[model samples]
Target: IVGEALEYVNIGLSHFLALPLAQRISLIIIIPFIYNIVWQLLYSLRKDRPPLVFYWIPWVGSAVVYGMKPYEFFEECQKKYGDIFSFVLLGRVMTVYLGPKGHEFVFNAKLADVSAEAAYAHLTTPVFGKGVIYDCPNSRLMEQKKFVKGALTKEAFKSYVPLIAEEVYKYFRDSKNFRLNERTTGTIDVMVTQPEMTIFTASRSLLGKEMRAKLDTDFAYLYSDLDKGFTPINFVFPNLPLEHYRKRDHAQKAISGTYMSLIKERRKNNDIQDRDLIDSLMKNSTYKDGVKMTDQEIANLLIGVLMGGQHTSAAISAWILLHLAERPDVQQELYEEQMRVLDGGKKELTYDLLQEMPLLNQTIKETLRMHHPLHSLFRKVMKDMHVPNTSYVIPAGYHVLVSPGYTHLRDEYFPNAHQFNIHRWNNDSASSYSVGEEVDYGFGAISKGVSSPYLPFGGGRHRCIGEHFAYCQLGVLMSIFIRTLKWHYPEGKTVPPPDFTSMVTLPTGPAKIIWEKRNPEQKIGGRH
Candidate 1:
């Protein structure tokens, strides 16, 4: 019976091929359109599965619409299919759960059921290099986080504040964007300045002065090549016979080679002190299972740690500057807060002093609330999992995604949620919504649950370890910018809409600011 049916199908295809080229093309397109709908109908009729989003193309599903504006596509899908729905993107089924409940479902799922490493390894392993970050097992990554976490302590940040401030002060004096020595007033694309500034500060504070010094040369350009490997295209197709991939490979080796050279020299001179991440890793990167990290792995882990903060801090720093540029009133208020806290600039900015600047801290808070660095957090399902209180079960080998960022924009959770008001955070309950038992997943103690709608740094075992350091670094960077200069957006230009094409959300083009010195005659304060 099957052979007879196959013979009939071969005959039908032969006749169809006999048609004109245009007709063949029409049928080729028409058949998939019909077949895709038929599959959706069959899938939706099953009660055990989530609703499948309707798409015309067979393999290329809701990708174009979802990629264009994810939040809008999500909102539209929510209204049509409620919270939990599955959509196809390049032949992979992505099941999304859309709120605080979803946050718990995905972020806190059992390790046996879901794997973050599997989801991210293809994208990150190449950029971060091998044997670090997602390239290793979860337990090893946890221990790696623990090793780096030791370097990011509050005591370390106390020293870091001045190092970071010195870098920021130096940048404005030398960078073409400001060049305060030659030009008092100027225009700069924050997209350019902020990333440069972020790398400078993070390297100075985390990797030590020797590494920070390298940024002035072609070493920094190598980082730019590495950064380009982190786009959406790379996420989908990690290895392509393309120029960017070629550069990504070359940059990773060169950058990691530099780190290895530094490591061997430090060992040769017996100069490994408790200064930065490299030193910390050199001293204490042993696993609980009795495995010690090689110098090469230490170098790769350094890249992972720096690359992690580079994207997030750069994006937020730019958004903070752009938002402040739009609202000079808030800028003046932040300046006043600094003055009041510092007693008219007599007291140097310190980690301790930054704690007293509530307005400065709140502005960072407000910026993070308005612009989350990561839009979607994902995990690949390793085992069949049931959505709580629902009939749907996501089968093994599928992917699950959550967007805490979506819940953050809701009016009910945050009144007038879209408004950029730092005062909104004045209500203590607003930021303190998620309170739960703390758990240490080898890095440090973090909230054990993922019930918060406001997860800028995320939660659970994979939560960002840079939260404290981010606040410290950003606090000092913005403080210096506020005290040294006054700035506003170019006339008739407001904050640009976020461009979601990159690994993180950055303001669209021409994110420029016009600035003049707050005190043109005075020299900026520094370690000197």
Candidate 2:
């Protein structure tokens, strides 16, 4: 069928080519090309695939249809093509699956059969370096995964909490006095609220003290650029070596150089006692042959941690704060919970106290469900595999995706899923949120079980390792914001939904909210 179609298309073009010079110029050069483009687009559309919207105009169609409103674009495809559909995107044919069954397929698929390396090779290879992340030999990738997991021990996590808290406190002290809003009320703004808090917390937990203090501003821009650089344009022109590419490259170099220097200094001292993530990675990392990681590999790993810890945590933090600002009643309930927990405690928040507060946990979980940072988790089929309970076989080398954003919002798992109800978690013990599931990713109990319809941090072996740390950081930041400042969404303003391009999604713009210091003399205990 394809051959016949191509033959027909070529014959049409040949007739145009055989025309006279004047006729050829108009009919062959201009008209044929236009016709061919339209034909390809219409043909592709007729395939009936989900997430595939064909446009005759090159680039602009995709930019408008896919780039402008991705969720709606996908929804249109779903309406036409159903839950699972196949179509070509940017030149490669991809298969998309939605909801729980889709997630179950991807999570249950074997790593050997559907390695993330091959699936994301186009994006990961050029940006993260060739060999380590995308082109890594399977055995080497497995070894590295094991080594990183070993480094993230219970003792290591316990030590990391206090360091993270201290970092958060220091960041607050440094930036607390800034005028967040220009309005006469002078309230702390949500525009700066969540991101600043998240960055400070991430810096302490992942980047460590010396590095955090040194690369405070540089790290922020560099990380943002690296993320923004992962666009469809990057995939389309992987080796063009343009300015954005160079900027991304330079940022990685600066970050890596700083980390390498830190590693060297730590090694030279040989007596450093702080058991942070960096220290643990430095001490515990070993290759399959029992050799330690090179400075470059360690640097790359640090970059990954920084990228992971900062972007997602900041996004969730923003959502939580915005939601609280919008619903003052919920905010008051949260404030009361915080006051009850911290009545006579130490000056600083502790990990034990955080875990004890069930409402706080519920609030964060609800926020995660509502505003998951990632749009979809991409995977590749490495071998022909039968999807469970179905005759359909996914062929090797095919790209597959699972969207938790859709699944988390499913009414079956979370009744009234659209509503931002923290109490849903608190009210029902039999609900999936209460009983934890063992997610494949190191996040474990925080993610709970795989089948529970909650996957903000992803699932399976590649689950986020920094889930617990993220919770602690966000929890502390929220607690501090509630205690120190009174906040509200600016007049005539509402938090816009995320602007998603590819995998990672973020707030559409600076989430502007008003804030002000609470009077210390006033009893701040009553519900607002």
Candidate 3:
């Protein structure tokens, strides 16, 4: 019966694939209904499990339930079925894991057997181009990560502090009174304000001054559209010429043209200072045979950094501000910490001093735990692997995920997990709040032999290179804002739950806050 069903399904798929564009689109629209009929019919003959109940109301089920409130959907499924639950979506089987043990299995799974790049291939390849990630011929990610790790060394980190401080000061100096809403007095919405600062800061730190100034004009809009283009529809159908594709095309041209010009100028002079990340890449990067990277490769790398760094950092910074505005006590504590660290003086924050700011670090960690940017991490099984001491083995080619957002909120891991408590990391006194052992949720530092139960940046070999950079940016931005402005949310208005529309979760709608310059004596370092 199974063989016969497979044969029939394959035949139907072939026929569907051979249809014209219009007919194919019609089939695509009708696919959910057709899929349901086929799935129910097949399930009746199967002996292993019950038939999956999928809503048949066109895209309503897939979009509303899955798109809007996926965590709630996961919770509902966990209530019905145990830890592991299976469902079907977009003509593919989805096996979801909801508990701590399941998360461990998914995140700690071998990279060779469970490839992150492979699972995201259909979605990323079209926009990022071939060989960028999807076709990572020889674990280029592993190698590149090692190289970039060196780039963020102690010396590099120390050098970055002044640059970050200068950038922050420059932004506020110009846009101090830039009216976001004409009616609202002295209030600025960060949705418009911080993205500009983040882009410029990241550009200067990652690429050199020349490249930063050149790309600043065209890259922002291009990058924004390219990011928005990664919808579920794009994954289901890879060939669509959507707005994302156009934006990505424009970004590629803008970035590539800028890099090529820089490369040409550098070759002509050989006198350019090896100051920033771009300069380092040009002077250093070597191929398997010790050859230098091509201009296109360098360009793609820059684009990747811009995409990875800007949006996530900006979203995090925005959230930090919202939290500060909401909680005055915590905000005051942060201000006090800044004052103590700067020795009641107005000197710029250095990397050594940045590390020593315990309150700031704890605040950022707490914010990340409550609101992780990426909801889940993806991996593809390359070989059949059994769950430890369990009967089930996830088959090859299946996409797997482990969510930090879910794990961080688990009662077993973090007591009163839903509440935002920055003091959780203050001392061993709050040890009861910590999970005894961390289940592998993708990203952050989890394998250092001292577990923290949080995985905001992700873990393993592909852990975020910009973790320190992000912290520095957030820490400095928050410190400066608190020290410089007397700010609060609009009267009688509650802070909204973060909007998770993009990969990075940001505060939904405009985050309006009334602000005025503080008196010099009231400021952290007596600066007006």
Candidate 4:
């Protein structure tokens, strides 16, 4: 039968070649158009699968409309096909489940039925290096999360506050945007400064002072190359013979080797202490399975951990600043709250003191709700799975995506949801969804149920472990800005719309803020 099929294919090809050039071209185009319509016709006739969004092109289906404006795409699809729908993206079928029920459906799916590693490993492995993150088995990844989580204790965070604060102050003083000594006022772009501050503070507090110093020099640009590898194009085509891909590979090796040497130096000096994540991992990387992570793996794990919070933290901090820049009344309230809590700037910020500022905490929470780091969270279906209580089945090899972020923007859940009002959470301590039971997936205890509209850091087995660290770091960054400066968006400019072109939801740029020191006479090392 195979031989007969091959013979027929050969005869068909010969006939195609024998046709006139224009006729052959027309047939080539017409064949796929007919085939695409036929596939959709067959797909729509089936009742077992979710409704497929209409698309004209073959494999290029819905890429432009969905990629450019995903929320709009989701909204349109929800109206047309109800909550569950399927669309083709770069030749892959994506099944999106829209609201809180959808959240639980995707986030709480069985491990055997859905796999995040399968969905993300290709895009992450090259940038993060091998034997860690999505590249490893699910059990190993859980243990890796636990290993990194061990470093982020309350005691560690208490110590990190001042270190992160000092880094922010130092950047303000040294960075050309705000030379506290030379000039008190300047127009600064938050996108440039926020990511830099996130890396500096996170590296200094989490990695150590040495890594922070490396970033101060020319070594920091390597991160940019590494970051460029995480675009939408790379997600679709994992290995392209392109300039960014080459640079990404080079940056990974270079950055990972740098970490390996630092680990070696710490071992040689017998100088490991309770200093940072590196020391923590060095002492406690042995797995429960009687396996030990290799030194190179540790380097890669550090890369993964650092990169994990980089984009999210950077984006949230930037959005917070931009939002505040537009609202002077909120800024004033934030300032007054700082004065009240910090005893008129006489007291230094501590992890405990940050808890005293409810408004600050609410502001961070609000910003996260508005701009979730990722627009869509995906899991590849491993085994055929049913949408609970429904006949529709997502077949094996199809991808499932959930958007708790979308849930965050619904007026049904949050009144005036589009408005950026931190006060909505002012008196409310309860989460967007009712608190469910707690479960630990090796890292630590987190809410087991994903029936929440406010999952900025995600939920379930793959929930972000850096939630506390993000709060600590962003709290310190926002606190310092509140006490030391006052800023607003450039005149006639409110906050910009989101730029979804990148992996995270960043504000469309020139995300600029105009600012002046609260006390011009106050020196860099001096009190506010």
Best by TM-score: 4
Tell me the spans in candidate 3 whose CA falls farther than 4 Å from its real position. Answer: 1-63, 126-130, 176-185, 215-220, 225-233, 242-244, 288-292, 428-452, 520-528
Summed backbone clashes in each candidate are 0, 5, 7, 0
Per-residue lDDT tens digits for candidate 1, residues 11-77, read 9989987999999899889888898888899998999999989998888899898777788889999
Give the alpha-carbon lDDT of every model: 0.88, 0.66, 0.66, 0.90
Q: Enumerate residue pairs that collide in model 1.
A: none
Q: What lDDT, from 0 to 1, does candidate 3 have?
A: 0.66
| Candidate 4 backbone collisions, by pair | none
Candidate 4 wrong stretches, greater than 4 Å: 1-17, 429-434, 526-528
lDDT of 2 at 211: 71
Please give the distance, in angstroms, between residue 22's alpha carbon in candidate 1 and its true position after superposition: 6.7
| Higher-ranked by TM-score: 2 or 4 | 4
Cα lDDT tens digits, model 3, 114-201, are 7777667677665555445454643566555544555566687687777777666666654554422222237778777778778877
True-structure lDDT of candidate 2: 0.66
lDDT for each residue of candidate 4 in 110-153, tens digit (9 for 90 to 100): 88999999999999999999999999999898999999988999
Give me the runs in candidate 1 sitting further than 4 Å from their true place.
1-29, 427-434, 525-528
The CA-based lDDT of model 4 is what? Answer: 0.90
TM-score of 2: 0.82
Instruction: Decide which is better by lDDT, 1 or 3.
Output: 1
